[PDB]
């Protein structure tokens, strides 16, 4: 009653604040097995000393007290072992979050002409978490500077871009960065900005400063496009595709300088054109979008069990834009690096197999237990039913399905006869036994023998034959009008030992007689030694059709049909 | 901020709420205020508002409140740094019947929320800015009015802040010392809280020594 | 034995034999897991040799033994008529060493009741012992001319109790 | 009430000493510290004025 290690929870790539309250950091590895899983961890593809006061362990989860940049940063992986083999967790990279504040420098006061925009550097300091959200503020913190076609805030550089300057744009301006990962928000020194007023403001052409470059990104991702230009007349920005239609999943937004793509598909690949215009002139930028895809499963493997010596093929299939490479780890180490077609299974092969699909980009795991069988046959679980019934002139079939390992050979024995493939008698390979057109001499004592390389098993069967249940009087066809009372005739002959029933069917659908609706028009009155007729009251158009009487017992069943026509 | 696991708090339509910040130790006391994670400044009015202590107070929760999350934020003057507490969320419950042929809820008395009990004592130093707060809870948005024991409020120096829930004075002398109280007037009921304002004075120059030339 | 539907295990009198490492399995159809417990069999002090009363003739040598076994080892504390040994009336015959007290050439002097408190973190044990000096001839403590009956191949006993100032 | 209610309590149809260290009051609710069989047992009633 064995069972291999199976994972529930696996570790994730993780990040710890340098200046944290928490002095403890933790990684999860959770699994289940019949012999409890035993856990090992490795650091940078190298062993870790288990008890160091600093380091400690709890139920597969690893703990470090007072972790240090200098020491603990690296890639950790978790090995769940038992008696049946080893299984590697997903690679988990551990880093220390870094977010120093800005350079303390004074930022010079800024003077500009009305009608000419300008741009200010955030000066982003060192950061280990890269999920940076940028905005800009005025005088005091809570004030916020909003997106128009005039003003914009880059989400990559972190700077602020203005096309057209007005008297309202004067005052203090400060950068603002938030890291949601570590929940930290910091802001740069304020910069004074003054626009000198100018009447009959000097017009300037469209001038592209913010591009969106050739990018390789994965299937199904969120993707966002920045495109911005400058000039005295508020520049108008327009998006299109070169030589294809825009993807359905496109949203333009109010600003008209930012473009959303939900669920990038195969077809979106190619060039995208951004046209920045104004009253005076124009400019264009063309960008390359390359679609990729992480490896994603199609027929991931599952827990399989087979016999020894059987020729095996493991179907493992994933799909990626970069064609996936397949690796086969046996108990936490690579065993095969190609089509896992195996011949001549053995003792030692059995256990834990890991199918990994990695490309140039990403990797995905699939774990499976391959179990091996070599049991002697027993009838403990699926024994033979001792007693079986038969009628003359009818095909009859007997199950001999026990539980053996190497798919052994079969035999049947009638006391003083060995029975084999014949004209009317066949033993199909699954182990069951067929007989056609039975006779009185067939009834008797049969034994099923299951003959295995390693041991055999024998079960006993007793087979009795009875006088067949047949129909003496068949139903006769009838024609009537609407509202008539009709009768269908049926008589059968049978053996006293047997338990017999009568079943009436309409148009090859059995009347159940179990619900009150049917009894409205239909009635049954079985009597005598043979008599089993049916009555119909208040005939309708729908009632006309085929009526079949079936005399059914546990040995065989005999059927006979007739027709009913309705007029009016 | 200490990384804490936060289940969102729940409420039936129109019950009172006290949303607690409790920052990690702060010298000086940081600038406290409430933000959405969407980075929008959060709805503040007579009905619902933030305390000087930093916690947020809902006299009565409404339907709309479910729209967005509420996150506490604290600025430290010197390092120019802001700390963001893990954001909260709320859920509302409606028992209003579906009136046939086309506020369907119960109205309720006021109650005191921040200054529990009738009485409290505060100490402010001479010349300092004096600041008092009173927090109520009634289904019809209560109105806070501030008054003083057997004496008129100096209108030149005092003013209402934070939608009538805060009173602020200028330099405080022994004149201003005494007993101040606050009314949470509401359509259904009304209640007073008293505060003992003892003004104790920091040393100040009567005759400052000047240089002697002889 | 099993108690509480196999979720509790109980043992009788415990010794250092039973000390060690015990664990428990939560076998189940889906998974199974072990918990380990370090069973350190420590002990409140218990008497190995309890000091029994010393009867001596003038000039005979006696020693008091206070040996209690405990884990951790129990600390021995010596008092004289409930007075600290430090400030007790000085005696030349008396010699204290480790856990043992020695009187060589004992005399009428220093006749008192000595107390031993062997204690550790967990518990303590207290023992008293006194010395009595008398000068009496041997005495008979049972009935005269006893009649005792017994069968052939069975164990038997004759009780002839006695006592004397020097061990007769 | 519009002018906030003021509370009085009476013990055995008799007035009660308000601050006795023992006795104390909060928003119309009455409190006794270390109550005694000998002393406090009785019928109390509350007057909102
Ligand atoms: C990157 O891209 C991913 C998308 O791949 C973004 O993922 C987003 O995640 C959130 C969180 O799961 C999704 O939010 C959901 O929000 C709905 C709230 O809306 C419901 O109520 C609205 C008001 O009545 C109503 O307008 C909604 O219907 C609109 O929106 C849906 C999409 O939600 C849209 O398909 C419709 O056409 C409408 O326009 C909707 O009725 C909330 O109900 C969801 O919770 C349900 O499902 C969760 C399980 O997911 C379940 O646990 C709950 O009990 C409940 O049943 C869910 O929170 C959001 O939709 C995703 N964005 C999408 C799909 O575009 C991710 O945000 C992007 N990155 C960044 C950084 O933003
Ligand atoms: C004594 O007599 C018995 C009975 O006649 C003999 O047993 C017969 O042996 C033959 C030959 O080996 C078997 O035919 C094989 O069938 C295989 C397919 O088996 C599956 O399907 C069978 C039928 O199922 C039908 O319906 C399903 C569901 O709709 C369909 O999917 C299916 O296609 C059929 O239409 C099932 O009965 C069976 O359990 C399986 O599920 C074939 O794959 C097989 O061909 C292979 O092997 C050949 C050599 O054997 C080889 O030439 C081929 O290239 C290929 O490799 C073969 O055709 C019968 O199944 C089996 N039982 C019968 C007929 O009842 C027995 O051998 C004989 N003893 C002797 C001669 O010593
Ligand atoms: C005087 O003292 C002697 C010796 O001490 C006593 O003899 C004992 O008598 C008892 C019976 O009262 C004996 O118990 C016997 O046990 C036998 C089995 O002994 C073996 O297994 C036991 C454990 O079950 C071991 O402890 C032991 O070592 C042996 O290995 C039974 O077979 C006996 O029953 C049969 O024989 C007796 C004989 O007297 C018959 O009367 C019974 O009807 C029966 O047929 C018996 O039960 C015990 O073994 C003896 N020895 C000891 C050392 O105790 C006398 O009892 C005592 N009084 C007299 C002699 O009057
Ligand atoms: C904190 O508050 C306390 C309490 O109010 C202040 O302390 C004392 O307050 C009393 C008022 O209760 C003052 O008494 C006043 O004294 C005035 C003296 O006149 C001079 O000072 C006036 C301002 O106090 C000033 O306006 C005046 O000039 C005016 O008239 C001129 C023409 O004549 C004109 O040109 C000027 O521009 C101006 O309009 C004189 O300079 C008197 O005038 C008042 O009527 C009143 O009697 C005390 O003086 C206050 N104590 C002191 C030491 O001055 C305390 O000052 C407050 N502290 C702060 C920092 O505000
Ligand atoms: C827990 O408490 C018990 C009870 O007090 C302690 O048992 C004492 O153990 C000591 C040390 O072994 C014994 O001294 C021995 O005595 C032997 C004689 O034992 C025979 O007679 C017993 C009745 O008096 C009888 O129970 C015993 O049979 C049992 O033990 C046999 C051991 O061989 C076993 O074969 C039998 O099947 C049965 O289980 C004997 O017939 C003697 O042979 C030894 O040489 C030695 O002198 C004490 O006698 C025991 N106590 C009693 C009352 O007999 C035990 O040590 C305690 N354990 C802890 C950890 O504290
Ligand atoms: C399949 O075919 C094999 C080989 O013929 C059968 O093996 C023996 O079959 C006979 C049939 O009569 C069995 O006798 C039966 O015993 C039943 C109860 O079993 C009792 O004996 C068993 C062992 O006996 C064997 O070993 C002794 C050793 O001294 C030999 O002397 C015997 O000859 C036997 O070989 C015990 O294990 C069991 O606990 C019982 O005490 C009884 O109910 C039946 O009425 C009948 O008398 C014989 O037991 C079989 N022996 C073995 C080893 O299998 C086999 O039974 C057949 N199986 C079936 C299902 O038919
Ligand atoms: C944007 O950044 C700018 C960068 O400096 C900043 O100037 C601007 O606002 C603040 O503006 C105030 C005044 O409005 C400045 O305060 C002044 O400081 C002077 C010395 O540096 C001082 O002499 C002056 O004094 C005035 O008042 C006294 C009476 O009290 C009178 O006697 C004098 O004659 C003067 O009239 C005044 O106090 C700040 O220095 C300045 N910078 C800050 C606060 O950082 C920023 N805000 C906006 C909206 O543009
Ligand atoms: C393995 O899983 C696939 C996908 O669910 C399923 O089609 C297949 O039949 C499974 N095979 C086994 C042996 O469970």
Author numbering:
A (entry chain B): 37 to 604
B (entry chain D): 136 to 237, 248 to 359
C (entry chain C): 304 to 471
D (entry chain A): 69 to 117
Which sentences from the paper describe this structure?
Cell-surface expressed contactin 1 and neurofascin 155 control wiring of the nervous system and interact across cells to form and maintain paranodal myelin-axon junctions. Defining subfamily features are extracellular six N-terminal immunoglobulin-like domains (Ig), four fibronectin type III domains (FnIII) and posttranslational modifications, i.e., N-glycosylation at multiple sites and a C-terminal glycophosphatidylinositol (GPI)-membrane anchor. All four members are type I transmembrane proteins with six extracellular N-terminal Ig like domains, three to five FnIII domains, various predicted N-glycosylation sites, a single transmembrane spanning helix, and a ∼120 cytoplasmic region with a highly conserved ankyrin binding sequence. To address these questions, we structurally characterized the contactin 1 and neurofascin 155 interacting regions, i.e., Ig1–Ig6, individually and in complex.
